Amino acid sequence: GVNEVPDYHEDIHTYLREMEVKCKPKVGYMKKQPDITNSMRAILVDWLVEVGEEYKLQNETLHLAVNYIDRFLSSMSVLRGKLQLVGTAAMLLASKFEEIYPPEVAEFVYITDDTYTKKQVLRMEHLVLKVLAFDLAAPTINQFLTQYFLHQQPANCKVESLAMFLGELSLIDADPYLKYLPSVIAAAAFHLALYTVTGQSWPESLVQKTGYTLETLKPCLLDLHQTYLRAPQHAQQSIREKYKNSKYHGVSLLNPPETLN
Amino acid sequence: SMENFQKVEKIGEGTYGVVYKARNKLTGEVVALKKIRLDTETEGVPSTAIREISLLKELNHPNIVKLLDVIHTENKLYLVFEFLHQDLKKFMDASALTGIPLPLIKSYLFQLLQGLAFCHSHRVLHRDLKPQNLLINTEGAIKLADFGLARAFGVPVRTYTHEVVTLWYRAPEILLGCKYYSTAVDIWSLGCIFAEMVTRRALFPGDSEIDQLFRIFRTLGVPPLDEDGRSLLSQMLHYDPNKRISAKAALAHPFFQDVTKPVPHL
Ligand SMILES: O=C1Cc2ccc(Br)cc2N1
Ligand SMILES: O=C1Cc2ccc(Br)cc2N1
Numbered sequence: 035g036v037n038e039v040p041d042y043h044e045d046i047h048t049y050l051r052e053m054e055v056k057c058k059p060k061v062g063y064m065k066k067q068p069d070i071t072n073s074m075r076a077i078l079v080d081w082l083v084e085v086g087e088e089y090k091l092q093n094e095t096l097h098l099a100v101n102y103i104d105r106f107l108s109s110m111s112v113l114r115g116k117l118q119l120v121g122t123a124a125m126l127l128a129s130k131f132e133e134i135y136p137p138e139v140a141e142f143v144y145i146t147d148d149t150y151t152k153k154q155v156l157r158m159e160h161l162v163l164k165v166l167a168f169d170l171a172a173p174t175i176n177q178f179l180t181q182y183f184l185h186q187q188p189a190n191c192k193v194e195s196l197a198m199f200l201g202e203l204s205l206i207d208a209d210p211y212l213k214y215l216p217s218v219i220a221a222a223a224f225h226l227a228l229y230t231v232t233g234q235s236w237p238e239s240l241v242q243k244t245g246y247t248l249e250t251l252k253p254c255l256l257d258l259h260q261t262y263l264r265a266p267q268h269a270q271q272s273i274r275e276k277y278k279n280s281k282y283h284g285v286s287l288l289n290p291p292e293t294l295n
Numbered sequence: 296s297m298e299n300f301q302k303v304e305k306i307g308e309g310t311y312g313v314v315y316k317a318r319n320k321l322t323g324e325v326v327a328l329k330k331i332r333l334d335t336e337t338e339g340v341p342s343t344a345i346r347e348i349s350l351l352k353e354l355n356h357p358n359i360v361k362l363l364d365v366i367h368t369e370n371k372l373y374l375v376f377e378f379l380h381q382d383l384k385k386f387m388d389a390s391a392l393t394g395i396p397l398p399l400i401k402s403y404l405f406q407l408l409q410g411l412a413f414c415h416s417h418r419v420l421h422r423d424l425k426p427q428n429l430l431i432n433t434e435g436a437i438k439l440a441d442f443g444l445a446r447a448f449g450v451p452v453r454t455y456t457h458e459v460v461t462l463w464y465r466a467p468e469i470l471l472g473c474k475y476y477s478t479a480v481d482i483w484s485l486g487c488i489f490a491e492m493v494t495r496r497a498l499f500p501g502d503s504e505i506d507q508l509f510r511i512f513r514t515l516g517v518p519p520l521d522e523d524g525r526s527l528l529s530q531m532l533h534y535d536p537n538k539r540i541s542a543k544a545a546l547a548h549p550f551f552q553d554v555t556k557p558v559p560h561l
């Protein structure tokens with residue numbers, strides 16, 4: 035009904051499509067960071083997942099923080115010793131933005147195991163706001179998925195879970211997923227999830243909304259399929275652990291399909 | 296930072312902070328400053344401010360108050376806003392005996408709807424529409440203001456903060472604590488406000504949550520309004536959120552087929 039905002043769903047889709055282009059980090063910002071690497075970022079994002087899980091935060095929150103981190107590191111050289119401070123402030127900001135009941139600052143200090151003081155977190159919060167110029171309303175993969183899931187028939191709660199799962203896996207890996215827009219990553223995940231569970235593939239209804247075909251979405255699906263394939267081997271395992279729970283129906287335990295087209 | 300601004304007088308307050316009218320010494324522009332104290336050893340930048348600032352940056356529309364600048368000290372946040380002569384509530388009060396001409400009501404309602412459809416078109420609930428948060432100038436414009444309780448929504452919506460909208464202007468889906476609420480809540484508010492510009496007294500002045508509910512019930516389940524006026528109002532005040540008119544739809548409504556833009560009696 036009105037919950038699905040019929041009179042606005044399209045206007046909102048268009049607006050998100052444009053914003054994602056502008057709220058997009060630099061591809062290979064990481065090559066211009068002398069002190070940090072893709073691997074360190076992966077550790078940081080995986081930790082944010084676990085934080086999110088510990089505090090029962092929205093997935094939307096996690097996605098926002100990742101956007102905030104990548105844009106921030108797109109502008110500012112950060113030493114290794116300070117990477118986790120950027121991430122903590124980011125998750126705090128995202129929590130202030132997105133959650134009904136954000137954790138207090140003191141909890142964000144606690145999860146850093148007293149590596150940083152409350153003052154450092156609060157000062158970094160301000161720095162992050164400045165560097166992003168208070169543009170916090172970033173479109174996420176999650177904001178696309180939530181829309182994509184409306185074009186299901188029926189709704190399957192396994193496909194939803196599995197789509198969220200795949201979308202999150204992409205958060206971990208700057209290489210390759212920085213070069214893809216959230217809307218594109220979101221589609222790839224939707225398809226993969228459907229196929230894996232239903233055998234059905236990227237709906238037609240969603241072709242008309244997006245202008246994305248299995249054609250345009252090929253590179254990403256390839257990469258995603260790879261990532262899905264290799265997930266049990268990957269150094270970071272918080273997302274798999276997260277999706278083993280009954281909450282998400284246990285879809286990280288499913289076997290990937292060997293092949294597509 | 297603020298050397299260029301001259302305080303003129305205080306114009307309001309809130310947990311938000313203190314609101315001053317002020318003059319740019321170099322340009323002569325008159326502005327409103329919202330001073331937001333930062334909690335630099337406890338909570339940092341309040342979530343209200345983070346939402347108000349970030350959402351107002353995106354929204355540039357003639358009927359949404361313009362955020363001109365943000366001045367980042369280490370201890371204070373100053374929000375520089377365009378100055379508008381006053382809020383609708385003071386205008387209503389000043390108009391209690393004389394009334395507000397129907398062309399003005401139509402114009403004002405037309406503008407409010409334009410403003411709000413832009414909000415909705417861009418994933419933003421306002422969630423605090425009332426006459427006190429709507430500002431008017433001397434030239435016949437009205438604008439949405441005070442985005443402190445606003446929220447960027449997703450599609451479809453999730454459970455959001457219950458404690459939203461001043462009581463009198465709160466939609467029934469919120470009073471009854473329905474798991475989900477959406478753009479419909481803002482339309483209800485504009486509904487109440489429409490009625491209020493006509494009578495110059497609130498439609499549903501409840502003393503409590505039950506009193507509010509009862510007032511809404513007995514009324515749905517304004518003398519000087521034409522047939523079209525009454526039609527639109529009832530569609531804005533539909534009990535069912537799914538059935539409630541949208542901002543976009545309401546802009547088409549026949550009531551507005553003859554809309555102009557009068558200046559008010561200030
Ligand atoms: O520094 C470390 C060691 C460690 C253990 C577990 C998780 Br999750 C993240 C990290 N990062
Ligand atoms: O002690 C820890 C645990 C941990 C998690 C994540 C990051 Br980034 C750094 C660290 N250091």
Ligand SMILES: O=C1Cc2ccc(Br)cc2N1
Nearest residue numbers: 175205207208211212216
């Ligand atoms: O929303 C997005 C867009 C994006 C780009 C790159 C990586 Br890694 C993750 C994500 N998630």
Ligand SMILES: O=C1Cc2ccc(Br)cc2N1
Nearest residue numbers: 053056057167169352353
């Ligand atoms: O440089 C940029 C990127 C960007 C994103 C959003 C908004 Br609003 C403004 C701007 N300007």
Ligand SMILES: O=C1Cc2ccc(Br)cc2N1
Nearest residue numbers: 167168362363364365367
């Ligand atoms: O320093 C800043 C950051 C910022 C955010 C929003 C607006 Br409007 C103005 C400014 N200037």
Ligand SMILES: O=C1Cc2ccc(Br)cc2N1
Nearest residue numbers: 327376378379440441442
């Ligand atoms: O949103 C706000 C609060 C406020 C009060 C008064 C005037 Br003039 C402008 C503004 N801006």
